[PDB]
């Protein structure tokens, strides 16, 4: 097909979790949740992530208890059979902004923003695609392109026409640790936080892989030595032929 129908190819940035011996940067996961709550969560749900999985990764046990207690959840009904409400606890999941998908399309001119719990594994490109999309909105479309009313131009989206406007602008978030919050800084932090949401096993998997590869490559070298020892009598065998006398 045409290159506009494919989308532009995302380049390769030097993420600090690329490499077989590397973990996530946990100060960038903590900074990326703050950009989620203040910017992304107006229209996106994060439905696969529970509150308890954040403890010991980006926040303390006392911090997550206060974040969960700002939302309201359904309780067991009353003794008369009437419904009830309750604040949140650590075993709950992070709530979304819309009650159903009919209400989500009505607030976004017919388009449905997806769930972001698995969006890194569900796109070709990975972390490089999400970073290039958020920082790749031009100030004007190229000459000749006719956009429908309510669409924006982004060359990394297949077709070039996306229903999400540019959201990230400089100094819209005041960071806690004092990092300057530019456009590229905030786009790097959400992509690290969203990769943890898709792969929370990532730091533990790369440590069990170091133990397995060392043991299995030692067993492979020891078995070549043992095989060459047991086969040494067959490999140096010799044969002599003296033709028998024609008595027979």
């Amino acid at each position: 097909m045409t290159a506009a129908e494919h989308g532009l190819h995302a380049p390769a940035y030097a993420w600090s979790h690329n490499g077989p011996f590397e973990t996530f940067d946990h100060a960038s996961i903590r900074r990326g949740y703050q950009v989620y709550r203040e910017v992304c969560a107006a229209c996106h749900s994060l439905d696969r992530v529970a509150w308890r999985t954040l403890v010991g990764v980006s926040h303390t046990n006392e911090e997550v208890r206060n974040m969960a207690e700002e939302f309201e959840y359904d309780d067991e009904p009353d003794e008369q059979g009437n419904p009830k409400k309750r604040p949140g606890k650590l075993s709950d999941y992070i709530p979304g902004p819309y009650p159903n998908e009919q209400a989500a399309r009505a607030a976004n001119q017919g388009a449905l923003p997806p769930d972001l719990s698995l969006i890194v594994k569900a796109r070709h490109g990975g972390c490089d695609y999400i970073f290039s999309l958020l920082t790749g909105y031009p100030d004007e479309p190229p000459a000749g392109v006719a956009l429908p009313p309510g669409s924006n131009y982004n060359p990394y989206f297949p077709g070039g026409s996306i229903a999400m406007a540019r959201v990230l602008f400089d100094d819209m978030v005041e960071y806690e640790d004092g990092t300057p919050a530019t456009t590229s800084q905030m786009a790097k932090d959400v992509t690290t936080f969203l990769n943890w949401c898709a792969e929370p096993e990532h730091d533990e998997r790369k440590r069990l892989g170091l133990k397995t590869v060392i043991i299995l490559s030692s067993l492979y070298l020891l078995s070549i030595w043992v095989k060459k020892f047991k086969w040494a009598g067959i490999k140096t065998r010799k044969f002599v032929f003296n033709p028998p006398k024609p008595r027979k």
Binding site: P20, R205, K206, L208, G209, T212, V213, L216, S217, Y220
Partner: peptide
């Protein structure tokens, strides 16, 4: 050994 390099890495 080749299968463990695909499963873990």
């Amino acid at each position: 050994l080749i299968l463990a390099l695909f499963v873990f890495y």
